[PDB]
Write a protein that binds this ligand. Sequence first.
Ligand SMILES: *O[C]1[C]([O])[C]([C]OP([O])(=O)O=P([O])([O])O[C][C]2O[C]([N+]3=[C]C(C([N])=O)=[C][C]=[C]3)[C]([O])[C]2[O])O[C]1N1[C]=NC2=C1N=[C]N=C2[N]
Length: 342
Amino acid sequence: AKIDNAVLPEGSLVLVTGANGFVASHVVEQLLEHGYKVRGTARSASKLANLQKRWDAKYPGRFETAVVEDMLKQGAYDEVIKGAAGVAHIASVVSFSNKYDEVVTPAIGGTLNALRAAAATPSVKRFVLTSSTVSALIPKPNVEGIYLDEKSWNLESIDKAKTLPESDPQKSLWVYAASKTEAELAAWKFMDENKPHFTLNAVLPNYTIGTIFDPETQSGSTSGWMMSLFNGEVSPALALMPPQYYVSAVDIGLLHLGCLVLPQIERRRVYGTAGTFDWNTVLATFRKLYPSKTFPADFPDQGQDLSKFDTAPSLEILKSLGRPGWRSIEESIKDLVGSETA
Ligand SMILES: *O[C]1[C]([O])[C]([C]OP([O])(=O)O=P([O])([O])O[C][C]2O[C]([N+]3=[C]C(C([N])=O)=[C][C]=[C]3)[C]([O])[C]2[O])O[C]1N1[C]=NC2=C1N=[C]N=C2[N]
């Protein structure tokens, strides 16, 4: 098909964990769009019901719901991984609890449980892990000299995630960062120690903006929080998010696809970082898309993100898939909130 020399044959089955999630649903969408069959897991079939209906209508018989109530359970993937040529492990703890135990441990456990299943399944040749830019750093507004590459690790989050008092408003963020960081480190360590017969790549998105396919049963994650602002809600949690990088949900789906099928992408940490933004650029975009609508006034200046990311593999993947360059923030936000038109 489109993808020449794809490592996974046309129509191959890909297992996507936590398929009812926001980012995962976009990864599924892109896989289906490219002719691959997908078996997506969710803690309940009901959680995927609306998305199943969407995909059955758009991609008849290409998506299959698979129930995995406990992603940490021994043998959890024995049945659903059968025949899969690729695996995309996307599910992770996003409760933003300040409890290191309820976030970090399960994050690592879920990651290794999926990796072990893949290692035990000869048919699996490619594995893509959804990490995050927080596995490299927590944004530091107005700070110069920050360049993140594939060797950048958020080592400071591991210590802060358990040294910071619960009163620090960034506590849960550091715990989440430690969970992502330790989970990804564990994945690469597993690869180097066990040397399984599949290739691993990780996608590290920053703030993912895009269409929430199932508003009914999808909270939306990052995009859901942005939608709440669109609807006029200004939550303090929103203030716990500093200026950083955005990335289109469409592009994140494409990066996962590239990691699963492009031959030139192996053992890479692919940054999903299109450009910088802050809540005021978001509000500005809202006002541009809906000139007649009332929106909250600008937030106080929160500085700007002066960091830079090594996006070489990301750009290589996008170009190889025929969608070169990053989708703009205006188009990304429009994918989420639409525009004033008729
Ligand atoms: O169930 C659940 C779901 O499926 C998931 C989640 O989803 P949400 O919430 O939507 O979120 P998200 O975001 O999509 O997530 C996914 C992934 O990705 C990542 N990231 C993201 C981003 C943005 N968005 O922007 C960036 C970066 C990165 C994260 O981290 C993750 O990994 O999941 C699931 N879960 C939860 N919890 C749990 C689960 N499963 C199972 N178990 C448990 N515990």
